[PDB]
Amino acid sequence: ANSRWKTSII
Amino acid sequence: GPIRKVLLLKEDHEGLGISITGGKEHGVPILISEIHPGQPADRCGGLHVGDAILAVNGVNLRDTKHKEAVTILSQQRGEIEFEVVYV
């Protein structure tokens, strides 16, 4: 996937 | 979709059990991108991939930057009320 947007596991 | 209120219960040894993406700097809401199996969000039943998190325990998250949302969300303990919407 793109992944321009930040992702966090919480 | 309709704005929903969803209760999540968790103990202090676990996280929320979600991955979030987006935030103000990306021009989109804080969005649930993953619900991790067997963790509190999965167990609560009412949170799903694609839900935008509008507020948690009354704290608005609609104009929050990604990391701001991480801090706010990770601070919440015990019985946690989410305001969410699927769109």
Numbering used by the authors:
A (entry chain C): 1 to 10
B (entry chain A): 284 to 370
Task: Quote the authors verbatim.
In previous work, we have investigated the binding preferences of a PDZ domain that is known to interact with the C-terminus of the cystic fibrosis transmembrane conductance regulator (CFTR). The CFTR-associated ligand (CAL) controls the apical membrane half-life of CFTR and is a validated therapeutic target for the disease cystic fibrosis. We have previously described a peptide array-based approach that enabled us to design a selective inhibitor for the CAL PDZ (CALP) domain. The result was iCAL36, a decameric peptide with sequence ANSRWPTSII.
In order to test which positions can accommodate a modified lysine residue without a substantial loss in peptide binding affinity, we substituted residues at the P−1, P−3, P−4, and P−5 positions of the iCAL36 peptide. Consistent with our SubAna data, modifications at the P−1 and P−4 positions yielded the highest affinities, comparable to or slightly better than the affinity of the template sequence. The structures of CALP bound to each of the substituted peptides were determined by X-ray crystallography, for comparison with the structure in complex with iCAL36. The refined structures reveal similar peptide conformations in the binding cleft. Furthermore, the electrostatic potential surface of CALP reveals that the site interacting with the P−4 acetylated lysine residue (S−4) is positive.
